[PDB]
Amino acid sequence: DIKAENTDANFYVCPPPTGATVVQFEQPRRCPTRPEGQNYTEGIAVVFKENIAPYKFKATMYYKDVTVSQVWFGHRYSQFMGIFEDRAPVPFEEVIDKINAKGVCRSTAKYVRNNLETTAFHRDDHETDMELKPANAATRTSRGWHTTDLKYNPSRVEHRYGTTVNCIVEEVDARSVYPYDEFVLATGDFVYMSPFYGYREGSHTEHTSYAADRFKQVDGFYARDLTTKARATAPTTRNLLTTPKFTVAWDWVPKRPSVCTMTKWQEVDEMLRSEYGGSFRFSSDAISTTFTTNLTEYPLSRVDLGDCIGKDARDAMDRIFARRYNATHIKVGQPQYYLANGGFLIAYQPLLSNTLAELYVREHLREQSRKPVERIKTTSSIEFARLQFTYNHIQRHVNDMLGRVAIAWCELQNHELTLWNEARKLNPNAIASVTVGRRVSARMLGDVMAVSTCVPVAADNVIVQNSMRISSRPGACYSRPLVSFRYEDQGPLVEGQLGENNELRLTRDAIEPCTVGHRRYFTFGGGYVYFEEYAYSHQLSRADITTVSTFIDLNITMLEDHEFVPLEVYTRHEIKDSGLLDYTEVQRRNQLHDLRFADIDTVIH
Amino acid sequence: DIKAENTDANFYVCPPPTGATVVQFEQPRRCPTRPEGQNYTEGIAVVFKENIAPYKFKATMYYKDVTVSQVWFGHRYSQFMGIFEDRAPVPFEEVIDKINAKGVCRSTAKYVRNNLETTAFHRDDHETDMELKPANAATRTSRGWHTTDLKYNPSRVEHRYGTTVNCIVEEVDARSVYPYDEFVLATGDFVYMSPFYGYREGSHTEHTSYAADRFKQVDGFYARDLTTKARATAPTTRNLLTTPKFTVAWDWVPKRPSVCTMTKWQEVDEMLRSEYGGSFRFSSDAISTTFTTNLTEYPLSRVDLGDCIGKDARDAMDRIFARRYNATHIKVGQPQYYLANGGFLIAYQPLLSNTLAELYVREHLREQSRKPVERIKTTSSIEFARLQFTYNHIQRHVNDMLGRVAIAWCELQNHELTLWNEARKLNPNAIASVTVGRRVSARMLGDVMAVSTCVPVAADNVIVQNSMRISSRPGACYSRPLVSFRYEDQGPLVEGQLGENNELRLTRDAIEPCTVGHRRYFTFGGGYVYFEEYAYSHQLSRADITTVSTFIDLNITMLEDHEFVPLEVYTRHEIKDSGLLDYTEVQRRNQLHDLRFADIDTVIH
Amino acid sequence: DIKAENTDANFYVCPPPTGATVVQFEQPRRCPTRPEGQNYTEGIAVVFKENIAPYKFKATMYYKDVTVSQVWFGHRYSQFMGIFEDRAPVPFEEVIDKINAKGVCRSTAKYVRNNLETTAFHRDDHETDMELKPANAATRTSRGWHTTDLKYNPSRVEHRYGTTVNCIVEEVDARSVYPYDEFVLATGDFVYMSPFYGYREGSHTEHTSYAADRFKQVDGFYARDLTTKARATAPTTRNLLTTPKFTVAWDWVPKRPSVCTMTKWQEVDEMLRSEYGGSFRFSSDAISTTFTTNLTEYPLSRVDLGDCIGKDARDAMDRIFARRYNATHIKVGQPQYYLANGGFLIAYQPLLSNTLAELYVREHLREQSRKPVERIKTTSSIEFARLQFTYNHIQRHVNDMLGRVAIAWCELQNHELTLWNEARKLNPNAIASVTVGRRVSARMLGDVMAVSTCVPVAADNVIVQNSMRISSRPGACYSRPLVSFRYEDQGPLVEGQLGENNELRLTRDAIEPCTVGHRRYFTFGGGYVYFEEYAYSHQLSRADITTVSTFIDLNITMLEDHEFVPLEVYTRHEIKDSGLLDYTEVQRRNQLHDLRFADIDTVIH
Ligand SMILES: *[C@@H]1O[C@H](CO)[C@@H](O)[C@H](O)[C@H]1NC(C)=O
Ligand SMILES: *[C@@H]1O[C@H](CO)[C@@H](O)[C@H](O)[C@H]1NC(C)=O
Ligand SMILES: *[C@@H]1O[C@H](CO)[C@@H](O)[C@H](O)[C@H]1NC(C)=O
Ligand SMILES: *[C@@H]1O[C@H](CO)[C@@H](O)[C@H](O)[C@H]1NC(C)=O
Ligand SMILES: *[C@@H]1O[C@H](CO)[C@@H](O)[C@H](O)[C@H]1NC(C)=O
């Protein structure tokens, strides 16, 4: 007769549970603990890197442009038969007694060349001292001077050749590279001797490819400016090497101080040293890097030419404290040195707040414990350290915040059990069915709960009695409707009344005193049945009623994917191209010349 | 007699609480609010970088190979006494009237060299014009031409010398670098003048190291191809510089347009400008970068030679809109220019959706507000920007999703209080003990709760009466068992009955009407006691019963650690090595020659 | 009379709800599902990169220093008129019959130069064979030998010139670059022929710029050491190219094996191949990189000179398995080759655990499915791959852990509904007011809930009756206080008693049997009212009572912002500077010489 309007649901008959099946709620579980926070040491650090810069210094070249042209005289013209150009090494004595001394040069070259002592007279006249004037102007140039301007050629009248001599002096830039046993000039000439060669200290062990009299060292030299004529106010030690083609002078200075194989790279006001995994971590918050190192300091003794390290190390460390923690913190021992992957040498100065000044004694002892010739190689890319630093910092948070939640969760559950405990006491069925993940019947046998599964009844095989007032015992009116049903389609018809959430209770025992304005709704099928004044009215669907929710919401979204495409500022080729001249490309073209423009096989007779 | 089988637990006696101790549940707390979302401006952007590429252009060299050999004649052989090679600067007039004009050269050189006007006749014959033929073949070469192939040497019959002259013309590649006041050829020769030198416009202020008649500028030049003989269809302005060793010609073109000190680097269809921390952010989603900048635009006026910037800037910006937002969006003003860390110049075109077209007026005003000679230096690494971009994007999510949860949590708690409120009303003890984190006794004094701590009773000092049926008042049967106990080992024996979770209630007041099939379980010690038909049966352990849980699970795992090792494609050395010839290495070896193979000290007599 | 002491709150009158308004709790929602985990293939991989290294090999130069000086004799001095230096190509026959054969050279040069067969006699004496002695010492040098030490100059007695001849032999280093059709020496001389030129195999198709008799190839050559005199134990194929200035010999070896255009870069013991988005992913956990590729293998056939690839590919792959999975896993087919963005060629060997050995047949078929002249260009930066790898790994976790929580949340809610269901049954008002987010009145009409909003009553317009014992029916004593009030300020005074949380119930129906020690607290205003023995005592504030909480706590903090500043080890300039000599800088200075020190315009007569 009155069948379910909404069929998108199920019905259940839950017969009383015997001691057949009984379960117990799990007890509160043990909660995880926030990890003991990492301990960080404050400290200052300076980071050094393989020094790739060459040694630089000033030098002065003295030499002579010795030219000899030969000329054939045509009836109405002239033709060079030859033009011989050479370089004469102005000698020690002329550089001291003539040039430096008075600012003049002789007009004559006299040197060895191919094992013979040749000699050139300017214009082939008697020797004549000539004042040196600055070279002509030119953008981007060291200083320079010369005596002669033009070239002297023989007249038709006449020594069938013409000789020219131009005394030249330049303040070239010198550059040398490790091992620094030879150096180079601005002109492109090598000089096969150490820039630190000399007679003072152990400097005489330095390298040299030349005989002893080539080299000479004036001890107490006041050079005078060739433009201002001024005299040096302080003396130096002037070195003078005389090669076959020139005499080169610079100021000798002690080696060790002058150079270094590592380069101070960065200053980190707040470098943090963490201890983990049998290694150290040096996170520079500002620089966004984290260096990894053994727990053993590095022997600066093992370093080849590293005087500058501790020099700068202290300077920066002394200078930094004086500004940042001049009175904020206190040093904990002496600077220390560690070598990180990437070949970065970290000098570290462990700090300590005035707050925990009590801990000084202990700390100190654990720092001095770390205290125990070759070159260090440095990678070009610091990327891995910034990755490390980055990844670590994020991982840290993620884990931290997440951990905290895992706990907040656990605890929450433990407590909520105090709520399910009493709740099952109320509707053992509701609670039970929501614990076994299925519809069951259950009752309380003391402190445990007995259960028994329910049987699904067809949605078609359920019918609602039309009234709710008992004819037999008037003055009484049930509170829950009555129904009929069959577990099978062709099956018999069973009596019983309705219960919460489509439970077809067999025994019709629920009744209340009859009343007026007694209208109710009942969970019937996929919707509700509407009874008014203890008598049926009509059916509905859940859609007809305004919903409210018991769930706090949460809109979690995924961090979506992202592709990192190859991206580069300057490609390799751009860089190569960034050089105005290319030796290789040119050489290749230069040496092709006679192949493209001549004939290198034919033999004439 | 009947003692606890499972001893891994505790018992408690909770005596009624007086007004001595009373507490109140905390009220719902104030929840945090989702931060006002960041506002992003849509826009197009082009990124420029310090231009490191040299200026390139085509040039043509004209010069002459002037050779003079001298030969001694042996009885049965011949030996060169000398071989003098030089370069003659074909002069302006010959390049215009002979070469370019007819495709021929003279067989004679006539130039200044060492302040004398020498002259060479090919084979020392009368002057003779000679057609230029292409140079021989060679892989990877500019074009070239010449008149002569072989070298003329004197016979034993005879001017005791032989003269050769080969007119050479090459279409070399020229390259110049900022400040562009001088340039270089493909052969390796410098030319100390600006490629933009000339007589037109302000070009005459350009640089030059040569006298005025060296340089000449034909205004209206139709060059003819030396291979195809074709004549140029359009005239140019042919420059011609005549150096001591050659005459070099190229086409003068105005400077400013021709060059630039910044290089268009990338085009970003969707560049996003965010405003934060007194700076801007330019995230290129595609390129995975984020640039940081002041909120003030950059003066392109301040830029040295940046004509190309706005040139390309517009081009790309006009071209991009036309494709992407041709009708999707609308421009919001004129392109703007900002300078980011790393020295990347960002030209930006703020966009706007047709949707919010109403906001045009306001936006425009806030963009025009930003509108207000030196070179910009660019880092080689864009890594920090990709790190920035990366880190920012992840941080964003993390914070966002996490924030949302913190709230969902708060709210959840607030509501659940409506559940604890009523629950304590049920089992004030259970709820109380789970709020003070310890076992206590409590009752409800109106709206507050009175409490009093419980006393722990030894697990050994507890005993269960064997029956549950009162002899005095048969027909009645308690619902909770009875027990005995002592707070001390040597202590007296106290009477009382059992309660939920090992509570030893002193007063034995819980009783129910006697029934059949009345079996129950009771929380006794580390397990349960089993009573059947109001009479003891046996004890158990919680292990014997199937557990169900009231906790929703969560399997949170840590993001584990990871080490980023130094990783590099090409090391520094590999790069250096990538050059076929090494000037330094060679020079070093070349200049050693006379040290290894001769004797540079001995003087013969 | 007795008004609220604490006014920081509100009062409400909740009149019974009719069927006017009725709502329903939302049903449990459908929960999201953990995504099907990504399937990863185990495998070994080797990564190759554009080979930028030049080809290297050893070579030997044989040539002669032919010098001719001319000397004028002064009365008391001597002057070089000229010094002509040249290089003579020791010929094939002399290198085989004299030098290599006996370790001696002739004292005479005889070669073509400028199309004439000149000849030099050492000191102009009869020919004389001379043993070659090692060159002098010099740090960092290939081997070398020579016959002569000094230079022979003419005496005043006399052929008015002096001739010198020094036979030179050096074991130079050779270098060639793709296309490898020409190579270079350590001295700086080009040799325009392929290092792989010869007569064997197809080698004769190799390049050459020289006539056929220049080149000669001895098939079966036992070179003898010029220092140890030892003879080679095994013969080679000695090549000998005779250029105009020297004869250069090396050992011919087949091309293809000798070179390669890609360079084995890294070995990845555990490379993981993921399949996604129509592409592959190759995450190297160790190297912290992830490569992206099409799902189609790459044709090694398409590779120009890649013999070495598969050579090394197998070697590493065979060598690795043998160590790691020698018996742990099993190979799944033949090595495969893919090309990733960045131009990295990935050779991959899919693996498989002995565990799932059953799946072999299927897998194999899906791998062989992927199996199907130009050079590959490689970026210099691997950063994007490490970013990819990094970002992906973090994203993975975040999403994963978060997803899990979203679920744990959903479920939690669904269940808790079983708790709100029964709770509303208890205090329909409390529960209702905490579901509509506002204070309302509600009752249960069967399975739905009827509601009706409450009316706010002024905090000023509320008053508490002083007693709680009814005079009319003594022996009885209400459980809840009584009050008076007005909805308006000037309004009438309404009777009614107090309820939970400031609800002003109109009907005074709550009463209990009178008792002693009957003290209670009541939620009155911003605090409590204290009644003792059914008679008023005093008021309080919530501050006076010790609070306990029903909320599990959670301290979520934000991951804070961080700025990644431009950071670089060596700048671009530092790198450029890292070269001891700079061809460009020098050339620029060299070619300026005659501008600064002479006069290149004046013509003398
Ligand atoms: C921090 O210091 C304490 C005291 O030495 C130590 O026990 C603890 O292990 C440290 N924290 C961590 C994360 O190791
Ligand atoms: C640390 O010691 C290990 C030996 O276990 C060595 O391999 C490594 O080179 C050292 N690391 C540093 C950076 O000192
Ligand atoms: C969840 O949040 C995202 C933004 O992260 C938003 O796009 C989406 O509309 C939100 N979902 C709902 C149903 O509000
Ligand atoms: C977005 O725009 C509104 C309106 O100007 C502004 O008030 C708000 O601050 C902006 N959002 C953020 C994150 O600042
Ligand atoms: C922005 O202005 C600051 C001054 O506060 C200056 O130091 C910085 O160079 C400027 N940044 C950029 C990228 O314009």
Ligand SMILES: *[C@@H]1O[C@H](CO)[C@@H](O)[C@H](O)[C@H]1NC(C)=O
């Ligand atoms: C938790 O998840 C991880 C994978 O992230 C898994 O390895 C582990 O077995 C899980 N724990 C349990 C108990 O399921």
Ligand SMILES: *[C@@H]1O[C@H](CO)[C@@H](O)[C@H](O)[C@H]1NC(C)=O
């Ligand atoms: C893993 O393998 C199964 C079986 O082929 C497949 O159905 C599933 O899609 C794979 N997992 C993922 C993430 O695709």
Ligand SMILES: *[C@@H]1O[C@H](CO)[C@@H](O)[C@H](O)[C@H]1NC(C)=O
């Ligand atoms: C893959 O194929 C696409 C065509 O859709 C092509 O553009 C790309 O170059 C290929 N990628 C690789 C790395 O092979």
Ligand SMILES: *[C@@H]1O[C@H](CO)[C@@H](O)[C@H](O)[C@H]1NC(C)=O
């Ligand atoms: C929350 O945790 C942070 C550390 O992440 C801490 O600084 C802060 O004090 C904590 N808040 C409280 C109230 O404990």
Ligand SMILES: OC[C@@H](O)[C@@H](O)CO
């Ligand atoms: O004068 C051009 C000549 O020096 C060539 O060898 C340049 O490559």
Ligand SMILES: OC[C@@H](O)[C@@H](O)CO
């Ligand atoms: O002929 C070799 C000679 O030029 C050397 O100086 C090369 O280093």
Ligand SMILES: OC[C@@H](O)[C@@H](O)CO
């Ligand atoms: O002797 C110096 C001369 O060679 C210059 O051209 C160097 O730049």
